[PDB]
């Protein structure tokens, strides 16, 4: 139709929530088409390898997860979702690989190893310590490792929404991190993606 881009998403996927949170922050007019709501034949036409989400424009289509949000940030420049200072931007760009490779797989391990009797219980405890041992390491900044809302916050919000549907909820016990969680969910970009 008249929408600038069409984002084909899949339910309960952090890579789909990431795109939505960013496309909302940019205020780019988007049409959101949920996966599974398509014909099994068309699902193979949009993405031949069933990799979601998919972002389509008139002349271009992209579904690479490691590079999607970096494209949304460069394609729609304002507002900038990367830090303005060089040293700060060089680090966020590394923490993005850290999050994708160190913290997103643990979500899959909560879905995959939900088949082990007492494995989930051991995993919630490990993830809990990983945070509490980090709520003290990080404090005194509005957003994740920066003064402004960044791509790292989209990565994390999407991860927070998906864990929160798997039973792992962030309580007062995460204090510094819980206040950071309350500010994240207050933003309109993260709010449209949570319902």
């Amino acid at each position: 139709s008249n929408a600038m881009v069409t984002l084909y998403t899949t339910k309960y996927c952090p890579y789909s929530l990431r795109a939505r949170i960013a496309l909302a922050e940019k205020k780019m007019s988007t049409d959101i088409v949920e996966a599974g709501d398509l014909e099994p034949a068309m699902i193979k036409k949009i993405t031949p390898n069933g990799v979601f989400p998919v972002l389509m424009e008139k002349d271009y289509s992209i579904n690479n997860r490691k590079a999607l949000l970096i494209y949304i940030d460069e394609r729609f420049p304002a507002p900038s979702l990367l830090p303005n200072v060089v040293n700060e931007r060089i680090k966020i760009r590394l923490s993005l690989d850290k999050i994708d490779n160190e913290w997103y797989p643990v979500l899959d391990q909560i879905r995959k190893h939900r088949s082990d009797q007492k494995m989930l219980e051991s995993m919630f405890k490990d993830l809990k310590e990983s945070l509490l041992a980090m709520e003290k390491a990080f404090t005194g900044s509005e957003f994740f490792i920066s003064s402004g809302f960044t791509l790292a916050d989209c990565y994390i919000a999407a991860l927070i929404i998906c864990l929160e549907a798997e039973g792992f909820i962030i309580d007062d016990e995460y204090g510094a991190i819980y206040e950071y969680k309350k500010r994240l969910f207050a933003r309109d970009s993260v709010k449209k993606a949570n319902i």
Partner: protein, 203 residues
């Protein structure tokens, strides 16, 4: 002052890519070959500032970044001239998507083949996987380069993918892997591709 310290190892294709890019940027960097015995003091500091003594690692007074896709980005922030990427978001996305493919298909496997514990049957199946896709990969790199140069004839930027693939070919030969192509022109291009002055200076 321009402190920049780059941790590397000899005959490491990753360290050869970053060193060549620092050379093209004319950036002030101090190369440290952690393989050499005299540099044992630096290696100790390396296992301190990186989770696994990652190689290579770009170390400054402020940060320590270790992935190739990250290092190339960081280098672009510290030294923008000349630019290594195109100007249009589509082309930049494709260059990134292509860098990931070349890293997982070739760069990661070139490092597996250098393992002294790799079984002979696996090594040979690894070299054949790389031989099936190298030509098709090189054609796409050139394809994206011709598009980006034509879309902005005045931008006059460098194609990092061409720089990375040059080292793939180089390590193909180093490891006795055949570049499967009877095309006379591809051999000429590869021939001139390995003859660029900045590439000789790196080896």
């Amino acid at each position: 002052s321009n402190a920049m310290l780059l941790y590397t190892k000899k005959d490491d294709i990753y360290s050869d890519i970053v060193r060549m890019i620092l050379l093209i940027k004319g950036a002030n960097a101090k190369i440290v070959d952690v393989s050499k015995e005299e540099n044992s003091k630096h290696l100790e500091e390396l296992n301190i500032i990186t989770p696994n003594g990652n190689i290579p690692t770009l170390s400054t007074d402020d940060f320590a970044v270790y992935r190739l896709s990250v290092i190339i980005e960081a280098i672009e922030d510290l030294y923008p001239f000349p630019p290594m990427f195109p100007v249009f978001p589509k082309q930049r996305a494709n260059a990134r998507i292509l860098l990931e493919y070349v890293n997982k298909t070739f760069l990661q496997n070139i490092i597996k083949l250098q393992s002294p514990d790799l079984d002979e049957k696996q090594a040979n199946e690894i070299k054949m996987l790389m031989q099936r896709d190298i030509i098709s990969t090189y054609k796409k790199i050139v394809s994206e380069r011709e598009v980006n140069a034509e879309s902005n004839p005045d931008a006059q930027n460098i194609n990092v993918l061409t720089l990375i693939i040059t080292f793939v070919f180089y390590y193909f030969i180093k490891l006795k892997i055949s570049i499967p192509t009877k095309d006379k022109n591809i051999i000429k291009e590869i021939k001139e591709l390995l003859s660029e002055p900045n590439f000789i200076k790196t080896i």
